[PDB]
């Protein structure tokens, strides 16, 4: 029912590592570079963390809820899911 959004993410094993990734994004490193260096998501770490376009019910609830609260280009605080901790960036909104 929701409009499709496009997002990238960096998946890490713990919250301290997620806060560190978030801080490094403001220290001169790009999201695409940090995804290659830190992300545990094999399917997106080779694509700058891009997950492509998705709508409601495509991603796990914890990820979907956090992503739909972000403004365009906004980077989330650490988001816990069953896969670990995510740093999410919404790159496009309907």
From Swiss-Prot:
This is Foldase protein PrsA 1. It comes from Bacillus anthracis. It is found in: Cell membrane. It comes from the Bacteria. Belongs to the PrsA family. The lineage of its organism: Bacteria, Bacillati, Bacillota, Bacilli, Bacillales. The chain holds residues 130 to 221 of 287 of the full protein. Residues 2-92 form the PpiC domain. Plays a major role in protein secretion by helping the post-translocational extracellular folding of several secreted proteins. Important for the secretion of the protective antigen. The three PsrA proteins in this organism show different but overlapping substrate specificities.
């Amino acid at each position: 029912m929701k409009p499709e959004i496009k997002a990238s993410h960096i998946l890490v094993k713990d919250e301290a590592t997620a806060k560190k990734v978030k801080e490094e994004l403001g220290q001169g490193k790009s999201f695409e570079e940090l995804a290659k260096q830190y992300s545990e998501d094999t399917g997106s770490k080779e694509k700058g963390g891009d997950l492509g376009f998705f709508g409601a019910g495509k991603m796990v609830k914890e990820f979907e809820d956090a992503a739909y609260k972000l403004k365009k280009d906004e980077v989330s605080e650490p988001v816990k899911s069953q896969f670990g901790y995510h740093i999410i960036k919404v790159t496009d909104i309907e």
